[PDB]
Chains A and B, each alone.
Chain A
Amino acid sequence: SLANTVATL
């Protein structure tokens, strides 16, 4: 299962 949050660079 994938992470739920992806912060931008």
Chain B
Amino acid sequence: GSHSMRYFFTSVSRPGRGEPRFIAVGYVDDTQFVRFDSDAASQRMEPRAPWIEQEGPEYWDGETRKVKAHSQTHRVDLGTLRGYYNQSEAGSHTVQRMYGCDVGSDWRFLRGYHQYAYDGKDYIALKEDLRSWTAADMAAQTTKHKWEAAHVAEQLRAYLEGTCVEWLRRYLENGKETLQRTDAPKTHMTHHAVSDHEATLRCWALSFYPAEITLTWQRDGEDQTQDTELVETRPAGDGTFQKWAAVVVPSGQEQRYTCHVQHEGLPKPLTLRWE
């Protein structure tokens, strides 16, 4: 199936003293494999998945050097942006950046990304054609004009379509035992009497990967959204994910309700029903 590689960067200014707090993380699909925290002792890009530990010294040296360069750019940006928005030097602000590439089911470049945010809102983003920019306001417009003149889009395009895809393919092969394996959700249902006449049926989906999944409730073969509750997909902590959906029903009529589970790891959707 399709796969992706993404890098997330966050820098928070600390006006009271010192430089911004900078944190960077790298992911392949829903698996984190590297990180950098300016607050940590190593001051180096660090591994977070076993399959990336195969890389030699030159890899870690280059990645460390580059992530530090990323850090400084963000430090400068915080200053530049404080001026663009005419803000005080006494408050703390945030800049975020995210970029990456996707390969399709054919394993060929599918698409690339490069977006930026200031204080949690879109600032500037590269469009899908990887040739134009989307600026959210006049501060971003100034940046856009400068990046057009410096041809930053062309440079990012060469990375996203080349280096990015090539490395994503390399990581996929090296960590194939996990990255190219889908973990079908382990499902079951629980029954909870909320009163003498009503009961809650909760449909569980556990230990699945990737995170993408859909849980739906039907009553007498027809989708039901009322009297239901769906929680946000959450990380188990061991690399897999969890989710559940519940419905309140009249005691004694549990048999009319079915929970439908769709996930890439299942040849066909599963259907659960209570006793």
B70 and A2 within 8 A (CB): yes
- Which of these, B7, B77, B80, B159, contacts A4 with CB under 8 Å? B159
What is B's interface to A at a CB cutoff of 8 Å?
A: 7, 26, 59, 62-63, 66-67, 69-70, 73, 76-77, 80-81, 95, 99, 116, 123-124, 143, 147, 150, 152, 155-156, 159, 163-164, 167
Tell me if A6 and B69 are in contact (CB < 8 A): yes
- Inter-chain CA distance A2–B7, complex, in Å, is 8
Which residue in chain B gives the minimum CB-CB distance to A5? B155
**Contact of A9 with B155 in the complex, beta carbons under 8 Å:** no
Are A8 and B80 CB-contacts (below 8 A) given A1-B163, A3-B156, A3-B159? yes
CB-defined contacts of A1 to chain B, threshold 8 Å: 59, 62-63, 163-164, 167
Chain A proximity of B159: nearest CB distance (Å): 5
Subset of 19 A-B contacts with CB under 8 Å: A1-B59, A1-B62, A1-B63, A1-B163, A2-B26, A2-B67, A2-B70, A3-B159, A5-B155, A6-B69, A6-B73, A7-B73, A7-B147, A7-B150, A9-B77, A9-B81, A9-B123, A9-B124, A9-B143
Extra contacts, 5 of them, besides A6-B69, A7-B152 (Cβ < 8 A), are A1-B59, A3-B156, A4-B159, A8-B73, A9-B76
Complex interface: chain B residues within 8 A of A8 (CB):
73, 76-77, 80
Closest CB in chain B relative to A8 CB, distance in Å: 5
Question: In whole Å, how far is B34's beta carbon from the nearest beta carbon of chain A?
Answer: 9
A-B contact count (CB 8 A): 41
Q: Does more than half of chain B's interface fall in helix, strand or loop, or is it mixed?
A: helix
Residues from chain B with a CB closer than 8 A to the CB of A2 are 7, 26, 63, 66-67, 70
Minimum CB–CB distance for B62 against chain A, Å:
8
Q: How far is the CB of A4 from chain B (nearest CB, A)?
A: 6
| Beta-carbon nearest neighbor of A3 in chain B | B159
State whether A9 touches B66 (Cβ < 8 A): no
Q: Is the CB of A6 within 8 A of B70?
A: yes
B66 touches A3 (CB 8 A): yes
**CB < 8 Å: which of B63, B69, B116, B164 contacts A9?**
B116
Cα distance A5–B70 in the bound complex, in angstroms: 8
- Per CB-CB distance, the 6 closest pairs between chain A and chain B, nearest first, are A6-B73, A1-B167, A9-B77, A2-B66, A9-B143, A3-B159
**B155 — which chain A residues lie within 8 A by C-beta?**
5
Which of A1, A2, A5 counts the most B-chain CB atoms under 10 A from its CB? A2
The complex places the Cα of A1 from the Cα of B67 at a distance, in Å, of 10
**Which residues of A sit under 8 angstroms from B69, Cβ to Cβ?**
6
Q: Nearest Cβ distance between residue A3 and chain B, in whole angstroms? A: 5
